[PDB]
Amino acid sequence: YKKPSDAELKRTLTEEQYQVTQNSATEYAFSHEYDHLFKPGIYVDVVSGEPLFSSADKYDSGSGWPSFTRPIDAKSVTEHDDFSYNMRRTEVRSHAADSHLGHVFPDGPRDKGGLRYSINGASLKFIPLEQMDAAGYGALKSKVK
């Protein structure tokens, strides 16, 4: 409920950020750095800068995309069913900017809830633990492992 026009996004995002978040174009498995990033911090929507994921919940599923057991809060994302490409899938988008993020699957680690949020790295901006104050995310420094 807080998204710019596509033309504004076209001039402010990279081609990969644009195609993934605005056209739901899945990045190639293993292609984004965030697939192999495991440092403390938060992952935010590239469009709104709203907090989406904590480093605490990030894990390697071996899929080739950033994987998380949960969003930072259920409120941060919007999920819906998708029956395209002949599949039953649940798409995940950010709440405020409504960016396409990826999909959620019921094959995540059971000790952490059983869900795998499979997210394009291109849909995210990583904010390191240390920069979280300077960038306005002080109050979430404690969701971070």
Ligand SMILES: CNC(=O)[C@H](CC[S@@](C)=O)NC(C)=O
């Ligand atoms: C290759 N990755 C896995 O098998 C991951 C690792 C889980 S975490 C909690 O370290 N497990 C699953 C179910 O994807």
Ligand SMILES: CNC(=O)[C@H](CC[S@@](C)=O)NC(C)=O
């Ligand atoms: C079973 N895997 C898929 O359907 C994945 C979705 C990954 S998340 C990042 O949307 N898509 C492809 C094209 O392999």
